[PDB]
Amino acid sequence: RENQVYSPVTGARLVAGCICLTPDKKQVLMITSSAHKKRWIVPKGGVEKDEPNYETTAQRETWEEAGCIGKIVANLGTVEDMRPPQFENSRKDSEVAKHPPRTEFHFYELEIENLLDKFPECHKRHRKLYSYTEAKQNLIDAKRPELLEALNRSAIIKDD
Ligand SMILES: O=P(O)(O)CP(=O)(O)O[C@@H]1[C@H](OP(=O)(O)O)[C@H](OP(=O)(O)O)[C@@H](OP(=O)(O)O)[C@H](OP(=O)(O)O)[C@H]1OP(=O)(O)O
Ligand SMILES: [Mg+2]
Ligand SMILES: [Mg+2]
């Protein structure tokens, strides 16, 4: 139902989520897409009308989707799903035809404080820690470069 919030400018869906890291920052928590059941992504979901801020949405989604609790330690800013629902070539480069973003993502970095075995989606998703290299490859395999950009902005140790 239309409890969902949209950018008054672009019409993009507003979504918040978490890059969840281990205290030592060597791993990131990933979950399986419910739709695309073999794609590994990060916890996120739609902002609802009642929610006062993006952090609220981000921590709600991180609990509901991954059973993960912790503390927001950084604002990672915004990224856009630029997937289209066909090309235009500018002489030394080529691009997809102009369209509004599907989704504007507000990401936060979270330091994991607990992972619980029971959570709302624990029967609908898998959840696993990954090092930077494996996480990067997951997000390429999932076709989600915008979630990789959010990961890259995080304090995750990349020197593997
Ligand atoms: O229910 P919420 O969490 O509040 C809201 P969502 O944003 O979490 O639910 C997502 C939504 O599906 P739908 O609206 O039908 O529920 C997306 O469709 P789109 O953004 O194009 O409108 C879909 O992205 P796409 O890959 O199909 O393009 C995404 O799959 P993905 O996991 O990100 O790959 C779904 O996430 P899942 O929670 O199912 O994993
Ligand atoms: Mg949701
Ligand atoms: Mg979601």
Q: Closest ligand 1 atom to the C-alpha of 4?
A: 4
Q: Do the Cβ atoms of 46 and 17 come closer than 8 Å?
A: no
- Ligand 1 binding pocket mutation candidate from 6, 14, 36 (most atoms within 8 A of CB): 36
36 ligand 1 Cβ < 6 A = yes
Range 78-82 contact pairs with CB under 8 angstroms and sequence separation of 24 or more: 78/104, 78/105, 78/106, 78/107, 79/104, 79/105, 79/107, 79/146, 79/147, 79/149, 79/150, 80/12, 80/104, 80/105, 80/146, 81/12, 81/105, 81/146, 82/146
Distance from chain centroid for Cα 148? 9
Structural domains for the chain = 13-153 (3.90.79.10)
**58 DSSP 8-state letter:** H
Please give the distance, rounded to the nearest whole angstrom, from the Cα atom of residue 15 to the centre of ligand 2: 9
The residue nearest atom 19 of ligand 1, judged by CA position, is 102
Which-ligand-closest: CA of 12? Answer: 1
Q: How far apart are the first and last CA of the chain?
A: 44
- Residues within the annotated binding site for Mg(2+)? 44, 61, 65
Q: Whose CA is closest to 27, among 159, 141, 147, 135?
A: 135
Which-ligand-closest: CA of 44? Answer: 3
Please give the distance, rounded to the nearest whole angstrom, from the Cα atom of residue 58 to the centre of ligand 1: 15
Rounded Cα gap, residues 42 and 146, in angstroms: 11
SS3 145: helix
Cα torsion at 15, 159, 25, 81 (round to 10°)?
0
> What's the longest Cα–Cα distance across the chain?
55
